[PDB]
Amino acid sequence: AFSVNYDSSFGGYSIHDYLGQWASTFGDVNHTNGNVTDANSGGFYGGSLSGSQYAISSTANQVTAFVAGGNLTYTLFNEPAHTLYGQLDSLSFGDGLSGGDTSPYSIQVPDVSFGGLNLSSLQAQGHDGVVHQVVYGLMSGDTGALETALNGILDDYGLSVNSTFDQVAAATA
């Protein structure tokens, strides 16, 4: 049930080119050994360490953001430590994060959204699970794991992340 939604200015962009611009604007939140605070942790909606959404804003520019949606839980110090797992079904990208407390997170100026991703991983796969690799890559400004997961969805339509948004819409609508 894969779907894409995009501002019409991105119709002629490849998926890869959009995500490359998004990543280079968002930068890298450096959520790493020795550098984690409240500033670069992001947050969940629906719980403190789990919920229907996870979202985070750029520490470089304070506005660029992404919202990950589905059913997600982070183990924090439970084994395997520091793993995000569960189901990742949507991702949205753009500028400005609001909500996240008594209402869901949303992006204030949305560029692109993917729905129906159907990505699922179990706790026991720890950091090798696809949902962990995708979202921790995004937090780090690395879209390599998401593109790999999108190529695996797209190959069934004969497309890839080198296809443009308009080419994907014509195959999926």
CB of 33 to ligand HEM, least distance (A): 4
8 touches Ca ion by CB under 5 A? no
**What is the helix (H) or strand (E) element at residue 120, kind and residue range?**
strand 119-121
CA distance 95 to 97: 7
Q: Is 31 annotated as a binding residue?
A: yes
33 touches Ca ion by CB under 5 A? yes
Residue placing its CB nearer to Ca ion in the complex, 35 or 118: 35
**Which is it for strands 50-57 and 84-98: parallel, antiparallel or unpaired?**
unpaired
Residue bearing tokens 């992006």: 107
Q: For the purposes of burial, counting CB atoms within 10 Å of the CB of 60, is it exposed (0-12), middle (13-18) or buried (19 or more)?
A: middle
83 within 8 A of 95, measured Cβ to Cβ = no
Q: Which of 135, 145, 146, 154 binds ligand HEM (CB under 6 A)?
A: 135
9 binds, among ligand HEM, Ca ion, none (CB under 5 to 8 A by kind): none
Residues binding ligand HEM (CB under 6 A): 31-34, 36, 41-42, 54, 74, 82, 84, 132, 135-136
Annotated binding site for heme: 31, 74
